[PDB]
From a paper:
Addressing the elusive specificity of cysteine cathepsins, which in contrast to caspases and trypsin-like proteases lack strict specificity determining P1 pocket, calls for innovative approaches. Hence, we set out to determine the crystal structures of cathepsin complexes with representative peptides of cleaved substrates. As a working model, cathepsin V was chosen because of the resolution of diffracting crystals (up to 1.3 Å) and crystal packing with accessible active site cleft. Reactive site mutants C25A and C25S of cathepsin V were used in structural studies.
The pattern II group (binding shifted to the non-primed side) consisted of structures of nine protected peptides and one non-protected peptide that all bound uncleaved into the non-primed sites. All peptides bound to cathepsin in the same manner, except for fragment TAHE, which bound to cathepsin like fragment VACK (described in the pattern I group). Two peptide fragments, VACK and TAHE, were the exceptions because their main chain ran into the S3 binding area. The nitrogen of the amide protection group at the peptide C-terminus was bound approximately 3 Å away from the ND of catalytic H164. The amide likely shared a hydrogen bond with the deprotonated His residue. At P4 and beyond, the features of the electron density maps became weaker and less precise; however, it was possible to model the peptides KPKKKTK, RLSAKP, GNYKEAKK, and EVCKKKK up to P8 in the averaged kick Fo-Fc omit maps. MPD molecules were bound to the primed sites of all structures.
Residue numbers in the entry:
A (entry chain PA): 753 to 756
B (entry chain AA): 1 to 222
Amino acid sequence: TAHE
Amino acid sequence: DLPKSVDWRKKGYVTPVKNQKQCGSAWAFSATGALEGQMFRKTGKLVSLSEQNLVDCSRPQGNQGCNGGFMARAFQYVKENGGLDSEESYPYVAVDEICKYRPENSVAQDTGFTVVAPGKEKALMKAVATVGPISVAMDAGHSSFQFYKSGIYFEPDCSSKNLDHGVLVVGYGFEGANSQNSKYWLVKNSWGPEWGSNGYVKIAKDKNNHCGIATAASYPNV
Ligand SMILES: [Cl-]
C-alpha cells in the first residue's frame, strides 16, 4: 500500500 | 559545476545501516535517513531518528505503518506534528504499535519538503551534490536485488515507474578514470549491514532512470  | 563524485558518509551525515526486519517500513527508514542528514547539516550533530515514531503515528498523514507508506507523508507528519523523537528514546520493534510520541524527546523538525522533478536524473544529481542525502523510491522487486553483493546494479526487468521500496541516495560516482563512464548512485538500504555491500548498493546512473531512482525523490526542509 505504498513503499515497503 | 557539480562534483564528479559525492559521498555524504565521508562527511558525517549518515548513521550506520539499520534493519527494518519483517515490516514494510522502508519508507520510514528512508525518511529518517534524509532528516538525519539535514539535521546534521543544520546543527553539526548526528542523531539517529525514530522510524517507529513514524510507523506508529503517521496514519493520519496517509501512511500505514508496517503495511507501507511514503517518505513525503512522513515529512508531512513531522511538520504537522512539530517534531520527531530519537531512535534511542522511541526504539524500533518492527510491528505496528500505539503512538507514543513525546515532545520532550523530539530531536528533529521540518517545515515541509522539497521534491526533485520526476524522472530527472540530473536534477537529482544536483540535489545530492548541494543538499545532502535524498529520499528516493525504487523498484527493488527482484531476486537480483535481494541477492545483490557488489558492482553496479543493473536489472533488465526493472521498472522506472512502478516502485515498491524506499531508500536513501547518499552520493554518486563512477568506476574507472573517466568520470562519465559506468556511473552509479550510492544507495543506503535498510536490510541491515549484512545485505549487499555493507548495507549499500551501487545503482546504474544516467541509464534512463534505472529502477526509477529519480522518479519520486524528495528531502525535508529544516
Ligand atoms: Cl514519497
